[PDB]
């Protein structure tokens, strides 16, 4: 019963479901960044 | 650690089910999602 | 002052047992689905 139901490492290969490069809203063009879906509607982007 | 506590469990649950409203439609009889509430996830095959 | 003038209830201080009252009647069952939405543009446009 954990809130994050998967063990996530930053070197895990992308799969497009919970580990993938993404682009969010931006003022202009943005470089995609690797992000991790830790729970439903909850994403984490380990980037400055 | 937040989800382990009772209060934090409630807080995360409320956050998850608080989906941003589909208020993007100029027509009152339609429901349109707002783009800024979404992201683009790049799939392995190259589609997003 | 009217005969219909509403009398207000108390203002209970937020105590731990009231938090437990809401915790025991909280619904943790339903979580909104990650539905399939129509694909947006490649670059999402938006500012803070």
């Amino acid at each position, epitope marked *: 019963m954990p809130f994050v139901n998967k063990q996530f490492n930053y070197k895990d*290969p*992308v*799969n*497009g479901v919970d580990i993938a*490069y993404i682009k969010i809203p931006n003022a202009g*063009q943005m*470089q*995609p960044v690797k992000a991790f879906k830790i729970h439903n509607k909850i994403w984490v982007i380990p980037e400055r | 650690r937040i989800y382990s506590t009772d209060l934090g469990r409630m807080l995360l649950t409320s956050i998850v089910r608080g989906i941003p409203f589909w208020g993007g439609s100029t027509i009152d009889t339609e429901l349109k999602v707002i783009d800024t509430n979404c992201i683009n996830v*790049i*799939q*392995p*095959d*190259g*589609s*997003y | 002052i009217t005969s219909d003038t509403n009398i207000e209830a108390a203002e209970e201080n937020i105590s731990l047992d009231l938090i437990q009252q809401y915790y025991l009647t909280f619904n943790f069952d339903n979580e909104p689905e990650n539905i399939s939405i129509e694909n947006l543009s*490649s*670059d999402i446009i938006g500012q803070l």
Partner: nanobody
Framework: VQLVESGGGLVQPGGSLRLSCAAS????????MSWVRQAPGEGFEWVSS???????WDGDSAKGRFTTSRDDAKNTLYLQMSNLQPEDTGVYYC??????????????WGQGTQVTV
């Protein structure tokens, strides 16, 4: 989903090259694409990538040296290399993802093109 590359076999350092990658089964301007090279007896290295919006991103290897272009009408991805170096030797593929560093399930690849410098 078919990808076939075509690029010059060899040239000694100090020159240039144009690699091509012809696609079939989809529209090349609608998916993120990448260029990735593999040196013999080693893993893959992300060379470049191109967005469906036409924006291209190149990694540490050959930034300012290589440029990634794409022709929508021809449905063909181009890699214009200049100032090649001996450490750029390997087999070059046009991978189907963004920053494609390994083989990922559901991802399409090409057979490769030999480049020796």
């Amino acid at each position: 989903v078919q990808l076939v590359e075509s690029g010059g076999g060899l040239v000694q350092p100090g020159g240039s090259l144009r690699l091509s990658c012809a696609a079939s089964g989809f529209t090349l301007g609608s998916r993120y694409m990448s260029w990735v090279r593999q040196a013999p007896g080693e893993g893959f290295e992300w060379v470049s990538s191109i967005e469906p919006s036409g924006t291209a991103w190149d990694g540490d290897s050959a930034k300012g040296r290589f440029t990634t272009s794409r022709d929508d009408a021809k449905n063909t991805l181009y890699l214009q290399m200049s100032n090649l170096q001996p450490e750029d030797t390997g087999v070059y593929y046009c991978a189907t993802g963004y920053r494609t560093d390994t083989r990922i399930p559901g991802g399409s690849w090409g057979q490769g093109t030999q480049v020796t410098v």
